[PDB]
């Protein structure tokens, strides 16, 4: 296995700003799609072990 | 008033390999237990500094470009200050950095300098210890002035029996001029020390002038004290700096050496 990692795509990109987070929403589902991918990796580390 | 003393002609100057001297904190930022890279003007490691030793006296004119490292292994304070300029003859401005028994004075009036200028201890004159004007003649067009008090002071060290190394850096960028320094008691008779130390910043001022040349200033048919000083030229480099846990640069890599 490897280390399970997840990222808050909003806290990484816009960390604690509302007025950045409203611009990040204009990029659609990209943050959710990254979170999904990292969750799929993280579940696979238990499947493997 | 020129006390013209051209006793000795231009001597082919001595040279000394500067091992790991010429590193300073690049900005007012605390950092700790981190290896940080910095593109900035620094003294290249293992580089030939010019070397000078004040019958033995020494105060030549030197070129200035990009910036300078200056250091001295000394006792009793003979090294007093610095001149900078472009023409040195009042076709352009020029500046003076004088230090004495305490204060520091800074001035950029359009000075005319004698061919062989320096500042002695004015024991007699019209009276004791007059203001350090005698390097120049005229000061009618002054665009900046500054003063400070606690600039450099000696170390107690059981009456200071060792020669105390004094290290400085002088630099300019886009109208600003900056100064950094450090001290260390050392036990080397005739050479610059192996080992490491960072220089802290001390002063900045906005001269707004071209600079192309500089010179040192020393005190006193006469007797005076003997001491060494060294000059290195800064260059644009990248250094990787190891900040220790206390946030002092403890080691560095000159990544073009």
């Amino acid at each position: 296995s490897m280390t399970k990692t997840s990222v808050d795509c909003t806290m990484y990109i816009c960390g604690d700003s509302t007025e950045c987070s409203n611009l990040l929403l204009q990029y659609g589902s990209f943050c959710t799609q990254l979170n999904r991918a990292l969750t799929g990796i993280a579940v696979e580390q238990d499947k493997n072990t | 008033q020129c006390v013209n003393l051209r006793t000795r002609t231009q001597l082919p100057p001595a040279y000394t390999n500067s091992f790991t001297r010429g590193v300073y904190y690049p900005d007012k930022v605390f950092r700790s237990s981190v290896l940080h890279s910095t593109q900035d003007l620094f003294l290249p490691f293992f580089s030939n500094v010019t070397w000078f030793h004040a019958k033995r006296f020494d105060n030549p004119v030197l070129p200035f470009n990009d910036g300078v490292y200056f250091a001295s292994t000394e006792k009793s304070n003979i090294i007093r200050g610095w001149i900078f300029g472009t023409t040195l003859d009042s076709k352009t401005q020029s500046l003076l950095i004088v230090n004495n028994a305490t204060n520091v004075v800074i001035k950029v009036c359009e000075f005319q300098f004698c061919n062989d200028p320096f500042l002695d201890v004015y024991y007699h004159k019209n009276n004791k210890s007059w203001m350090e004007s005698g390097v120049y003649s005229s000061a009618n067009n002054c665009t900046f002035e500054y003063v400070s008090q606690p600039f450099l002071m000696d170390l107690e060290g059981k009456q200071g029996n060792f020669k105390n190394l004094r290290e400085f850096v002088f630099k300019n960028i886009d109208g600003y001029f900056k100064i950094y320094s450090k001290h260390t008691p050392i036990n080397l008779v005739r050479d610059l020390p192996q080992g490491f130390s960072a220089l802290e910043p001390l002063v900045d001022l906005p001269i707004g002038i071209n600079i192309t040349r500089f010179q040192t200033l020393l005190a006193l048919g006469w007797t005076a004290g003997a001491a060494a000083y060294y000059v290195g030229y800064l260059q644009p480099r990248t250094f990787l700096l190891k900040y220790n846990e206390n946030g002092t640069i403890t080691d560095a890599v000159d990544c073009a050496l």
């Binding site: 806290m11 | 700790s32 109208g175 906005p206």
Partner: protein, 383 residues
């Protein structure tokens, strides 16, 4: 409630058995700290902007504003500035902000040259006698002064360098009067054909047209990399709290986090400390010379544990990576990113290895895993 936040994360009215991610929690700031140097004296903007006479561009003036309180609204609320363009800050934000130093440049030009004075421009003023850095931050200010600087015979004390061998470095000034060989022949002395004096008068007379009339110009060349600041807009500092989360502003470094008394010994030349991320993690307060650690206050993943909605509407919530000494500390008597405080009921709080689990009974009996929680824990629905 936490079940509803799963339904909108999955975008389904029913949810299968599992553990699911949802929007992160992050504890909100309780109140706002503001700190600036405890200076009080207002800056000398009058004589910087409304002195009796100003320098010619060949020897353009520089005055250093320092150790004082500005108020750039008292400037920008004036009608008198025909141009007031700022090139690395908004002119409105200047009050919420503080600077290492401010240099006020002052000079006079024909009203058509105000265009040349903006950063990275080019033209005879911008090339041979007054050049801004291309990376300049600051403001350019200008106004018409024909009704102040235009005596009927001609104000010929105002003048510009017509010729210069090469384009000058940013923020240089030149007072030399060297004669200029515009022809190939090496001229000397004082004058001759294509052997010009370098400095020429503006023809400023009160009958001149707009663009040929005299304009006073000021450039506020402020610098705001985080060296210890000396000129601030007018804002009241306030009492400094610790161990609570706050919005903070030190010298215009706005941020959010919890402050703490720090053993990080900044040397006297430093004021801010920075993390590997290029974010500040320590600060030296501008009113008490003391070093504070900044930690951005508690945040983590919120995962919801559910049987199927076709089995129950009970759910349990995992606050990932949290010592839930802070979960009951969160208490929605103030704001948070999640609104659902319902779970902070208590008497069920389990401090697990990978965070803290609210709303599930901890049992000493062991079973085969069902919903995985991490660090050896699983959850399941039973009698």
């Amino acid at each position: 409630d936490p079940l509803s936040e799963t339904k909108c994360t999955l975008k389904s009215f029913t949810v299968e058995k599992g553990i699911y991610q949802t929007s992160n929690f992050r504890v909100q700031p309780t109140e706002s700290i503001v700190r600036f140097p405890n200076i009080t004296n207002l800056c000398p903007f009058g004589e910087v902007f409304n002195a009796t006479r100003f320098a010619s561009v060949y020897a353009w003036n520089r005055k250093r504003i320092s150790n004082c309180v500005a108020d750039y609204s008292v400037l920008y609320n004036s009608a008198s500035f025909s141009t007031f363009k700022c090139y690395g800050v908004s002119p409105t934000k200047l009050n919420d902000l503080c600077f290492t130093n401010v240099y006020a440049d002052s000079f006079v030009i024909r009203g058509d040259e105000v265009r040349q004075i903006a950063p990275g421009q080019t033209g005879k003023i911008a090339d041979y006698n007054y050049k801004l850095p291309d990376d300049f931050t600051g403001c350019v200010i200008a106004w018409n002064s024909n009704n102040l600087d235009s005596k009927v015979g001609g104000n010929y004390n105002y003048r510009y360098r017509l010729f210069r061998k090469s384009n000058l470095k940013p923020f240089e000034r030149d007072i030399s009067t060297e004669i200029y060989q515009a022809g190939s022949k090496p001229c000397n002395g004082v004058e001759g054909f294509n052997c010009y004096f370098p400095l020429q008068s503006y023809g400023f007379q009160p009958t001149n047209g707009v663009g040929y009339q005299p304009y006073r110009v000021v450039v506020l060349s402020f610098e705001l990399l985080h060296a210890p600041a000396t000129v601030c807009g007018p804002k009241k500092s306030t009492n400094l709290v610790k161990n609570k989360c706050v919005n903070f502003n030190f010298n215009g470094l706005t941020g959010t986090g919890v402050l703490t008394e720090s053993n990080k010994k900044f040397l006297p030349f430093q004021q801010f400390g920075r993390d590997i991320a290029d974010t500040t993690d320590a600060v030296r307060d501008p009113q008490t010379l003391e070093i504070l650690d900044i930690t951005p206050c508690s945040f983590g993943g919120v995962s919801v544990i559910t049987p199927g909605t076709n089995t129950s509407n009970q759910v349990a919530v995992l606050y990932q990576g949290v010592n839930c000494t802070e979960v009951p500390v969160a208490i929605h008597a103030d704001q948070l990113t999640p609104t659902w405080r319902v779970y902070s009921t208590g008497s069920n709080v389990f401090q697990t290895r990978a965070g803290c689990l609210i709303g599930a009974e901890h049992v000493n009996n062991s079973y085969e895993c069902d919903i995985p929680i991490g660090a050896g824990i699983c959850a399941s629905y039973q009698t």
